[PDB]
Amino acid sequence: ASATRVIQLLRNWASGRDLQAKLQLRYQEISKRTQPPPKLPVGPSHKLSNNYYCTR
Amino acid sequence: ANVETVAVSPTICRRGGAWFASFGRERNSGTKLFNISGHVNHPCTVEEEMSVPLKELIEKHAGGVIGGWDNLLAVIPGGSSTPLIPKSVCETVLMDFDALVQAQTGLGTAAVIVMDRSTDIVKAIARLIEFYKHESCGQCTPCREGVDWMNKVMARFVKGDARPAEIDSLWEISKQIEGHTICALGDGAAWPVQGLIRHFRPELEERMQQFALQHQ
Numbered sequence: 698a699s700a701t702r703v704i705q706l707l708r709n710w711a712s713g714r715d716l717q718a719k720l721q722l723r724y725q726e727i728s729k730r731t732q733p734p735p736k737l738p739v740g741p742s743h744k745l746s747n748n749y750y751c752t753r
Numbered sequence: 754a755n756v757e758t759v760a761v762s763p764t765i766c767r768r769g770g771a772w773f774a775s776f777g778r779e780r781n782s783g784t785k786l787f788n789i790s791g792h793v794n795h796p797c798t799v800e801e802e803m804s805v806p807l808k809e810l811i812e813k814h815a816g817g818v819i820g821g822w823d824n825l826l827a828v829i830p831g832g833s834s835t836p837l838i839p840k841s842v843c844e845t846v847l848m849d850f851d852a853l854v855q856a857q858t859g860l861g862t863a864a865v866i867v868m869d870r871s872t873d874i875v876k877a878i879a880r881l882i883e884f885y886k887h888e889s890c891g892q893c894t895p896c897r898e899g900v901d902w903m904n905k906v907m908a909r910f911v912k913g914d915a916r917p918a919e920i921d922s923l924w925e926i927s928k929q930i931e932g933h934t935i936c937a938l939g940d941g942a943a944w945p946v947q948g949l950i951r952h953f954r955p956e957l958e959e960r961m962q963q964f965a966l967q968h969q
């Protein structure tokens with residue numbers, strides 16, 4: 698975050714752990730709100746030849 | 754009855770059935786009229802015994818294949834409705850019903866279309882399928898739709914504008930026409946496609962590869 702180092706030390710002593718390692722707030726490690734397009738594969742029964750429906 | 758069947762009848766009655774049965778193999782008796790056309794030196798209509806070998810007939814009456822017997826690529830022995838056979842089969846095949854049925858073709862009407870190695874075999878079979886497309890009466894669904902479907906697929910195959918998987922699908926399409934129609938025009942349209950797929954699949958696959966690499 699942006700907390701003062703003395704406040705950071707106070708938080709670490711009060712909680713007993715190192716809060717700077719794991720923060721509940723998300724800052725920049727999340728995925729981008731815009732993503733490249735996908736391709737989404739088809740499936741097993743998209744064959745043209747050995748795909749008579751009465752066998753599946 | 755066919756004109757030949759009725760025409761040979763008075764001679765059969767006069768000379769007897771035994772004389773007619775003297776010629777040809779068993780259950781394939783008598784003489785037959787052969788129309789040899791295509792890539793032969795002397796295309797012609799001739800009369801010959803039933804079980805004459807194909808090679809002997811071609812070299813004797815038709816003058817041989819254009820460019821020698823080693824130039825032969827394929828033969829359609831019974832008109833457009835019979836599947837083609839490659840050179841390795843036209844070496845020791847007899848021109849009767851049973852011998853040609855054994856080679857998976859059938860004698861049909863004894864019309865020998867000869868093609869040498871200077872031909873685009875896929876184009877010839879596509880032209881035959883287009884003929885069957887233009888001569889469909891359009892009554893029953895299998896012929897009416899599937900023959901046009903096969904014509905489109907073959908026309909696209911000539912350019913190599915498909916993928917190898919389609920080959921198998923085309924085969925199955927033929928199986929959905931043959932045996933499901935009113936008359937035998939559906940069977941006669943499905944059979945040449947099956948013969949081509951059976952005997953010249955590497956040619957189709959190579960053409961598709963060439964088109965794929967040329968067009969990226």
Ligand code: SF4
Pocket residue numbers: 888889890891892893894895896897934935936937938939
């Ligand atoms: S198979 Fe025969 S009856 Fe059926 S559409 Fe073709 S020509 Fe007509």
